[PDB]
Design a binder for this molecule. Structure first.
Ligand SMILES: Nc1ncnc2c1ncn2[C@@H]1O[C@H](CSCC[C@H](N)C(=O)O)[C@@H](O)[C@H]1O
Length: 327
DNA sequence: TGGATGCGCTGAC
DNA sequence: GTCAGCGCATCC
């Protein structure tokens, strides 16, 4: 994550729904905002959240009476994506994990915050012939909010990962916000190799499979894209090896394959998956952030998370818009 | 709401 | 056909 000199969100309160690791919390607090509520029902996610923020998020949001949620200015929610991801079955709203957005609408209707800041996977934007995004847009509009949505790729914001996500920023109409803008992309000067840990700390992650098939030559020049160098097995998810001179592939939460959830990388002549701390870095988390003691759970958590840097630029712009109140 | 890994249907070229 | 994917199915 980056340093934020001008705290655009100072004095503003926000809630952290579907909190996970608390990526939205890190981003908004870095801008000066204050978290007044968090909700996350996964046991291990609650543990790591508490480990880092000192509080246990409330459980199952579907059983929480929205009237009990503290007043706030910004509602944050990176809601479930299994039902909308290009990697899944795409059952969408028909999926038992795909109707959480309506719980969000339920809370917004009651708490009417100034801003609703949501995140989901890129496929959410085109899912069901664009009908899914349209539903969210119309729902927010009905709730009397403006709707700004755009897909941003983390590689355009200083983080070496091709993580494409749709970000939806909604302003309550009475605020008459007409100058919100998504952050502009800038040149990437950090690559996977810049975030790796010393070899001595990741030897246990080295995988030497006799069915490894190097398909492309390593590159010496850094490039802002994923560069596949080979595969193992049939080359499915988690069976692909990439160059560290390029950027990382999207981290996943339930990913399989031998290089599960992180993908494989060629490092000093060897092939290995990423260490939880390297996943944290590829997600923009500071080294000060404490990872969950279970590596399996940590990979899952980071795979479900958000790139802090991206949310920071967006949060800054949300604040920039709210603070522009000329006479 | 365990940990591990082989696997494909689909979206976007 | 090329490849990627906050995933899925199934094993212990
Ligand atoms: N009914 C429910 N109540 C509370 N949390 C839920 C939920 N259904 C799913 N979740 C949680 O929703 C999260 C979605 S992934 C969001 C991660 C978050 N942005 C962070 O930065 O890491 C998961 O952690 C999941 O456990």
């Amino acid at each position: 994550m980056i340093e934020i000199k001008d705290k655009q969100l100072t004095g503003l309160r926000f809630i952290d729904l579907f909190a996970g690791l608390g990526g939205f919390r890190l981003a908004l607090e870095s801008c000066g905002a204050e978290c007044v509520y968090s909700n996350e029902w996964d046991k291990y996610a609650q543990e790591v959240y508490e480990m880092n923020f000192g509080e246990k998020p409330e459980g199952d949001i579907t059983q929480v009476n929205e009237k009990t949620i503290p007043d706030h200015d910004i509602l944050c929610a990176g809601f479930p994506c299994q039902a909308f991801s290009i990697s899944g079955k795409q059952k969408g709203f028909e999926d038992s994990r795909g109707t959480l957005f309506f719980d969000i609408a339920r809370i917004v209707r009651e708490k009417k915050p100034k801003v609703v800041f949501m995140e989901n996977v890129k496929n959410f934007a085109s899912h069901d012939n664009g009908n899914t995004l349209e539903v969210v847009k119309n729902t927010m509009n009905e709730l009397d909010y403006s709707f700004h949505a755009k897909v941003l790729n983390a590689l355009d914001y200083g983080i070496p990962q091709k993580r494409e996500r749709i970000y939806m920023i909604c302003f309550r109409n009475d605020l008459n916000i007409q100058n919100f803008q998504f952050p502009k992309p800038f040149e990437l000067n950090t690559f996977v190799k810049d975030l790796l840990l010393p070899d001595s700390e990741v030897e246990h992650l080295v995988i030497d499979r006799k069915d490894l098939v190097m398909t492309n030559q390593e590159i010496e020049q850094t490039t802002p894209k994923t560069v596949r160098l080979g595969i193992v097995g049939k080359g499915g998810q988690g069976e692909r090896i990439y160059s560290t001179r390029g950027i990382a592939i999207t981290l996943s939460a339930y990913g399989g394959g031998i290089f599960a959830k992180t993908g494989g990388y060629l490092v000093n002549g060897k092939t290995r998956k990423l260490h939880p701390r390297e996943c944290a870095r590829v997600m923009g988390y500071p080294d000060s952030y404490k990872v969950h003691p279970s590596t399996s759970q940590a990979y899952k958590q980071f795979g479900n998370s958000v790139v802090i840097n991206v949310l920071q630029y967006i949060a800054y712009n949300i604040g920039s818009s709210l603070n522009f109140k000329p006479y």
